[PDB]
Symmetry: C4
Subunit: 87 residues, 4 copies
């Protein structure tokens, strides 16, 4: 749980630094982009540079599998007993 959390955070900071610099976004926006992209929500306009597109493509292939491993444990290995056992 701790390990997947670390990998997820590191993946998110890479994305924040990438998009803040190459796409010119304010860090809160580059984090938001990173997050809604790896979670496949996507409620954003696409990157506008060719370098942003290519990176986004590679980021999704590598990052999705991690982010979603993390979310299974987050809900299904921490919220579950918490919530379930009250019941």
């Amino acid at each position: 749980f701790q390990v997947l959390f670390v990998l997820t955070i590191l993946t998110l900071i890479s994305g924040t630094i990438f998009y803040s610099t190459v796409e010119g976004l304010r860090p809160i926006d580059a984090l938001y982009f990173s997050v809604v992209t790896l979670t496949t929500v996507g409620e954003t306009p696409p990157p506008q540079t060719d370098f942003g597109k290519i990176f986004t493509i590679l980021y999704i292939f590598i990052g999705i599998g991690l982010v979603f491993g993390f979310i299974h444990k987050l809900a299904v290995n921490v919220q579950l007993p918490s919530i379930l056992s009250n019941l």
Copy 2:
């Protein structure tokens, strides 16, 4: 089935109150946003305030795992026999 339904509804009402107040959306729109976000459909513009972005980020990590647990039972534990057994 009843329990996941409760947690889902509560997650959705939190989102409705959040976005109606901070993003200024009419409640039907704040519910729609909440729903299309946790289901990762996302066919909306992003939140426009920094507080909306941060909350959306935390909401997705916590909420997705629940919403999708709920949907497995909804289709796969209620529609299945209903539909299957006619066949």
Copy 3:
């Protein structure tokens, strides 16, 4: 495979009729909306009527679980041997 195909097609035609009439879309667009919504791709603007939003909300909860059951068999129960066995 045949059964999930039927349920999916019926779900898609409901959506086509719904959005063509209430959202005023041409049938090809109401089908496209229906499809990119149940698959959570979502690369569309949101519905614009309150009745469209509510229906979209209910449609996603009921429809997603079916559409994705169908897609597991489509790739994983028809394309798999086809492709795998050449190899």
Copy 4:
């Protein structure tokens, strides 16, 4: 791992050629579209031609199941030992 990689790449090149020609996109954009669509991220405007919509519909049904099989192995069969075993 090698086989799913081949099928994924071939699926992506079909999409690149399709959208570059029928939707008129520059190849980097037609690849980006293809990728964010099969991964259900979708942070793009929809196709604008009827032929683009229909193809997109068929592309998602056939392509998603493959792309996501590929991503399970990518993170869960190559990044896992790499990362896990350092720990």
